Write a protein that binds this ligand. Structure first.
Ligand code: MG
Ligand code: MG
Ligand code: MG
Ligand code: MG
Ligand code: MG
Ligand code: MG
Ligand code: MG
Ligand code: MG
Ligand code: MG
Ligand code: MG
Ligand code: MG
Ligand code: MG
Ligand code: MG
Ligand code: MG
Ligand code: MG
Ligand code: MG
Ligand code: MG
Ligand code: MG
Ligand code: MG
Ligand code: MG
Ligand code: MG
Ligand code: MG
Ligand code: MG
Ligand code: MG
Ligand code: MG
Ligand code: MG
Ligand code: MG
Ligand code: MG
Ligand code: MG
Ligand code: MG
Ligand code: MG
Ligand code: MG
Ligand code: MG
Ligand code: MG
Ligand code: MG
Ligand code: MG
Ligand code: MG
Ligand code: MG
Ligand code: MG
Ligand code: MG
Ligand code: MG
Ligand code: MG
Ligand code: MG
Ligand code: MG
Ligand code: MG
Ligand code: MG
Ligand code: MG
Ligand code: MG
Ligand code: MG
Ligand code: MG
Ligand code: MG
Ligand code: MG
Ligand code: MG
Ligand code: MG
Ligand code: MG
Ligand code: MG
Ligand code: MG
Ligand code: MG
Ligand code: MG
Ligand code: MG
Lengths: 154, 125, 102, 319, 32
RNA sequence: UAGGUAGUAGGUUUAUUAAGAGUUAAACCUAGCCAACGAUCCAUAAUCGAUAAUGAAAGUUAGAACGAUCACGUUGACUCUGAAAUAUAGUCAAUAUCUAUAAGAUACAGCAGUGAGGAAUAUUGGACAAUGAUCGAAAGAUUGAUCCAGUUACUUAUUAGGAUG
RNA sequence: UAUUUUAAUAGUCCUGACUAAUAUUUGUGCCAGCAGUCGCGGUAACACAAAGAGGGCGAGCGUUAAUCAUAAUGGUUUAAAGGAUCCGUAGAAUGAAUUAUAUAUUAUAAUUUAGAGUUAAUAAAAUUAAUUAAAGAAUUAUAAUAGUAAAGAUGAAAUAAUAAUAAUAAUUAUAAGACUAAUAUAUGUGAAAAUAUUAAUUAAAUAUUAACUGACAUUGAGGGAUUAAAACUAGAGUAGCGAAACGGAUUCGAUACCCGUGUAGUUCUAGUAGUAAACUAUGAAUACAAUUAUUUAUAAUAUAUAUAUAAAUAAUAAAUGAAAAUGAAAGUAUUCCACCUGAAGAGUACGUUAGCAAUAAUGAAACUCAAAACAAUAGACG
RNA sequence: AAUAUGAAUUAAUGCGAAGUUGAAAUACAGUUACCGUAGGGGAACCUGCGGUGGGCUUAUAAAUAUCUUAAAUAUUCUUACA
């Protein structure tokens, strides 16, 4: 769901601007993968399962009887009075999906513009969804895989 | 505008390029016959007695033209070559007559910017 | 003020900062590119020590607003590599610098 | 604010004032006269320090900034002279300290306003002869000569080729006394090249910058991850810089590891020649689609970028 | 818009109304 | 230009062609088909490139010149040869000119050139020497294709004096 | 003891700024004229016409006619521009979660309930639409009783009504049309237009819980319905107000503002038309973002009103903005629809469609110009 | 049937100074302006019904105030009494 991803991107933007430390995003495989990639690359302090009221300290089993009341809880970082996650926005909008071949991905990382997509800036990563998995664009190039560019997070 | 509207036609407007010499029919110049020679008063704030000629081009459309220089031999039934350009002060005239072309002689005793007005180079060698 | 420069030559990455009615789009440049920017920005850069840049000004082109916007953009819009690495917990490497190293 | 400004000297000079109406002189002309000094019956401006040519291997270039425009010096005493009220010349009241000590970089800089231009060093005839022998007589590699003497491979190849020309011009006894005087005069005009000295030696680790290495790239990796030049080569898809340095070291004609036998696998047929035939034909195999003149090609004859070339005899031919 | 262009449009509408009122007879004649 | 279509959409058979096909001719059925993402109608235009101009680029313009494709050889229809022509053939119809007054001949969108139109675009030139094309067993013959030259600053390039003073 | 001769004549545009060109001088004086834009010339002309000097391009220079580039890495409260409102069809528009396959961001199958709905129970409301049935005070007209000479309006008078019954004012009796006082905030409800004297019939609307369903949703070209006041077509009614008209006033005039008589209209039934400063000058929907104060509803912890969640309003942080300011948005994002590309011409002409008509919808081009427009600042003026 | 070119006399509109007739708008513009619509007038405009503020948010008092050791004690205290 690209609508949910766009909503989370705006939500993370707002929370970082008001400088809160804990935040909630929906429970979905796409969101979990997106958040965990952010967490690996160093934009989130901690990722946790949990309900609508707060993160769960102990192990909890997710069931249809409680699927509705599940939200992932993310922790944003700050440093030298500047949020680390400044801007995060989509590339492939829900109305215009972008599926780039691997060569175009390499061209994007090189510095050229493909499909009116601004190139990869320093301290930036473009997440790509290939075969139901979200990964950094460099990993897709190395893995030779192909897919749609999803978002930029700076 | 939604991309659905862009694909339906919406987008930046192409910069309009209106021709300032419509009656020339996309030609650098055209012949004509001076039906009348008139002196008109410039619009404010300029004040002068500007010499203009009413000319009928070969297309079949009459246009107003401005005779430049100091002293002209324009008169009725004079074959002149009308070009582009507009006399800004006079409202309505949007063409110029090429001095030195046709029966319109050049500017007498013109010694600077001759080609713009029509004049052989004095040798004096 | 103090303006961070990449290799004392150019800005870090691209900047798309907006000052009131002035849309500053600035992008980095190759070594030996020259200041291919608007004259106001060119003067600001030449006095600030920036030598290679490229950009375009959109919407309002008021000179004074442009000058204020570009100074601010240099100051805060851009971020240095070291600061990103520290706040990220990751390592950013300049391929150009490490290709020509020993 | 732009205006036309006559190029009056920046340094102060005496300006003509009340003058006879029948002189018709200009401040620029009197500035030149003050700078050159008197012209003698032979037409020589002996006073000017730049009239002569140095013979001490130290170039004598213009230093207008350091000498405040005082270009006059005694030909023999080599001491400053300036105009006085009486119109004569003599020692200045004080000594100019800036002229006293000049950095070597300034000595080698010919133009005051360009500190990035320096004059190369003239190699001694002995060094050229030694290079020639070692390349030819000793049968060594130009790479070795470059490494020992610090010169470039193109330079050493040029040295040997020019020395061969000099020998040919010598055994014909064609070089006249005038050429020898020219060489002697110009030899003492520029510094000699001392292979021992490090700062005169030219760097041999110079590589042309490929277009791709001039483009900035950045990777975000685990901090612990070691990144080296070879990984940069892989990500930039270029040969490692050290390897490119090694490759260009072998392109010299006399350099080690050189071979140009690539184009020896094309079928070429020479046609038979009979008596009375003024020409012979060579037939070189060329695959269809790769040979011949294109149909519908571009005609740049009437355009600004028309191709102009030269044939073997040197005639300008529209290629 | 302001009261400037509003005044201009008002006058144009008024003139059009009067012009169409005077030409009532001609309109009727031309339309039978 | 808001409704259009009536061989129109489809099905079955027969007829010509080497061939399918309402492409054409004949018979019988079904009631369809296109259309506000623009039908039908009207006006305009020869189309394109690995061609020319421009821009950082996506693009935008021209279609002169090199090449590719289409249509025409004053206008319209028909016919024999062939695999292919509605042929620059012929017939017929139409227009203008000429002499031979005849089911007469020609139509400079082949070269050169003339009058007009226009702001504007060239010689009523030399040779088949080279590359091709046609006829001929061959010798050879023809070639305004083609190769050259002339007019034109329309375009591009080179040159159109250095040192001293 | 030599080995032919021998030179070199560039034009064209500009010098106020955009735009490189400071060495000054003369002629004309809003004339002659120059000009791509701003503009120069009425005695200081760096701009016209020239001399000196200078700056470009160069066998070319200039000018005209054309092509490309020069800003959408845009906007619609106040500057061009949200449709009057909603319902809804197509959409080659967008749109939930898990798992398994494939030809992989798409499809198929299964499963799930966070969107979206259906039905019951519990609690509060008497609002909106339609149709009936009633109430209130006045106003005008007529009549009577007494009762006088003046009454009515205006800044002041006259036009219209008085001692001819005899007014005006007061108190009674009758008829009629229209409207709805506090409450009152149009609060609130309604899709908008609208909506507050009372009762009744029909229809719709809120929150919580239980169950049910299973992505059945959002937007919505075209289309459909409703749409103030004025206007028109028939039929009833016409008290008061009141275009037009006629009189009286002020003014030099007064085709008006003030006063009198006052027709259409204004009122009910059935219709036509579908327009407004139809305005929040702000289309609908979804996720999210920091505080405060006041009301409304829900929940039992209570001991007898403290505590948490929703909505509205008002003031703000951040953000946005040309600023004034917005502040569940005019902020951060996503989706869909409508509209804008300088002013004047012009929502005009022509055509078409629809109406009984007034008219409504659609909707150009020619001529002219370097204008035109919003926010805010400082004066001057009232 | 469509298209184009004319057509007596005639309706808009633009342009240049330019006088005549009023004073309609900007301030409370001297009758608040404007939107829709109907009627009237030499011309702006006037009047009638509803709507908007792109005018009144320009918003700013009916009023009354109190008792514990008044100091031999708080008011001082500069790292030590605690
Ligand atoms: Mg500026
Ligand atoms: Mg200048
Ligand atoms: Mg507007
Ligand atoms: Mg009309
Ligand atoms: Mg009739
Ligand atoms: Mg058939
Ligand atoms: Mg048929
Ligand atoms: Mg048939
Ligand atoms: Mg069509
Ligand atoms: Mg044609
Ligand atoms: Mg094309
Ligand atoms: Mg074309
Ligand atoms: Mg061609
Ligand atoms: Mg033919
Ligand atoms: Mg012909
Ligand atoms: Mg034919
Ligand atoms: Mg024929
Ligand atoms: Mg010909
Ligand atoms: Mg020509
Ligand atoms: Mg031949
Ligand atoms: Mg040339
Ligand atoms: Mg001039
Ligand atoms: Mg003067
Ligand atoms: Mg000028
Ligand atoms: Mg001049
Ligand atoms: Mg001169
Ligand atoms: Mg010159
Ligand atoms: Mg563009
Ligand atoms: Mg909007
Ligand atoms: Mg609206
Ligand atoms: Mg509107
Ligand atoms: Mg629900
Ligand atoms: Mg009474
Ligand atoms: Mg009430
Ligand atoms: Mg309300
Ligand atoms: Mg609404
Ligand atoms: Mg399902
Ligand atoms: Mg809807
Ligand atoms: Mg609709
Ligand atoms: Mg109302
Ligand atoms: Mg009636
Ligand atoms: Mg009344
Ligand atoms: Mg009245
Ligand atoms: Mg209706
Ligand atoms: Mg409207
Ligand atoms: Mg703020
Ligand atoms: Mg914004
Ligand atoms: Mg805005
Ligand atoms: Mg209309
Ligand atoms: Mg002007
Ligand atoms: Mg204002
Ligand atoms: Mg004041
Ligand atoms: Mg006429
Ligand atoms: Mg007034
Ligand atoms: Mg008024
Ligand atoms: Mg009236
Ligand atoms: Mg309203
Ligand atoms: Mg006002
Ligand atoms: Mg106000
Ligand atoms: Mg307010």
């Amino acid at each position: 769901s690209l609508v949910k991803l766009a909503n989370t991107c705006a939500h993370l933007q707002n929370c970082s601007k008001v400088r809160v430390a804990l935040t909630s995003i929906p429970y979905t495989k796409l969101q979990l993968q997106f958040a965990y990639n952010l967490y690996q690359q160093g934009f989130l302090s901690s990722l946790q399962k949990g309900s609508t009221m707060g993160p769960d300290k102990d192990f909890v089993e997710v069931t249809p009887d409680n699927i509705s009341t599940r939200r992932l809880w993310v922790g944003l970082k700050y440093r030298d009075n500047k949020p680390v996650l400044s801007s995060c926005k989509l590339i492939s909008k829900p109305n215009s999906r972008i599926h780039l071949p691997m060569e175009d991905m390499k061209k994007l990382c090189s510095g050229v513009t493909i499909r009116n997509i601004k190139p990869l800036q320093p301290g930036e990563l473009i997440l790509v969804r290939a075969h139901n998995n979200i990964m950094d664009i460099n990993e897709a190039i190395s893995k030779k895989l192909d897919g749609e560019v999803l978002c930029r997070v700076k | 505008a939604t991309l659905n509207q862009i694909k339906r036609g919406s987008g930046p407007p192409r910069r309009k390029k209106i021709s300032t010499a419509p009656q020339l029919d996309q030609c650098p110049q055209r012949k004509g016959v001076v039906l009348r020679v008139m002196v008109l008063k410039p619009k404010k704030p300029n004040s002068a007695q500007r010499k203009a000629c009413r000319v009928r081009l070969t297309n079949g459309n009459v246009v107003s033209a401005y005779i430049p220089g100091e002293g002209h031999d324009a008169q009725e039934h004079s074959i002149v070559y009308v070009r582009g350009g507009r006399c800004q002060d006079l409202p309505g005239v949007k063409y110029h007559v090429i001095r030195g072309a046709g029966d319109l002689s050049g500017v007498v005793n013109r010694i600077s910017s001759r080609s713009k007005y029509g004049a052989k180079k004095p040798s004096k060698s | 003020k103090e303006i961070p420069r990449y290799e004392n030559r150019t800005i870090y990455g691209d900047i798309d900062f907006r000052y009131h009615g002035v849309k500053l789009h600035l992008r980095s440049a190759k070594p030996g590119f020259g200041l291919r920017v608007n004259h106001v920005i060119f003067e600001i850069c030449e006095c600030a020590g920036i030598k290679d840049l490229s950009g375009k000004v959109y919407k309002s082109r008021n000179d004074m607003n442009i000058a204020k916007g570009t100074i601010e953009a240099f100051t805060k819009a851009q971020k240095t590599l070291d600061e990103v690495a520290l706040g990220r917990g990751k390592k950013l490497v300049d391929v150009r610098k490490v290709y020509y190293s020993s | 604010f732009s205006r036309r400004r006559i190029a009056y000297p920046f340094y102060p000079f005496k300006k003509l004032g009340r003058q006879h109406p029948k002189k018709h002189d200009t401040n620029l002309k009197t500035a030149m006269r003050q700078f050159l000094g008197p012209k003698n019956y032979k037409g020589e401006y002996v006073m000017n320090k730049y009239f002569t040519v140095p013979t001490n291997h130290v170039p004598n270039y213009i230093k207008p900034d350091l000498e405040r425009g005082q270009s006059l010096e005694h030909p023999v005493t080599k001491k400053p002279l300036q105009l006085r009220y009486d119109g004569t010349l003599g020692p200045p009241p004080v000594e100019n300290k800036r002229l006293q000590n000049i950095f070597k970089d300034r000595l080698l800089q010919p133009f005051p306003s360009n500190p990035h231009c320096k004059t190369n060093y003239v190699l001694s005839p002995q060094l050229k002869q030694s290079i020639f022998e070692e390349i030819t007589v000793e049968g060594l590699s130009a790479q070795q000569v470059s490494q020992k003497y610090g010169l470039k491979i193109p330079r050493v190849e040029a040295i040997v080729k020019l020395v061969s020309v000099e020998n040919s011009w010598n055994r014909r006894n064609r070089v006249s006394s005038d050429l020898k005087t020219m060489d002697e005069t110009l030899y003492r005009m520029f510094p000699v090249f001392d292979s021992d000295a490090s700062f005169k030696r030219e760097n041999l680790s110079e590589i042309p910058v490929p277009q791709k290495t001039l483009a900035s790239r950045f990777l975000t990796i685990a901090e612990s991850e070691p990144f080296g030049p070879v990984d940069a080569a892989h990500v930039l898809e270029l040969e490692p810089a050290v390897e490119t340095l090694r490759n260009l070291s072998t392109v010299g004609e006399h350099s080690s590891g050189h071979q140009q036998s690539t184009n020896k696998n094309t079928k070429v047929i020479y046609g038979e020649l009979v008596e009375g035939e003024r020409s012979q034909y060579k037939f070189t195999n060329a695959k269809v689609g790769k040979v011949g003149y294109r149909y519908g090609s571009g005609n740049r004859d009437n355009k600004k970028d028309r191709r102009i070339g030269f044939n073997k005899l040197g005639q300008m031919v529209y290629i | 818009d302001s009261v400037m262009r509003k005044r201009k449009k008002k006058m144009k509408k008024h003139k059009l109304r009067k012009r169409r009122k005077r030409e009532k007879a001609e309109r009727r004649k031309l339309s039978q």
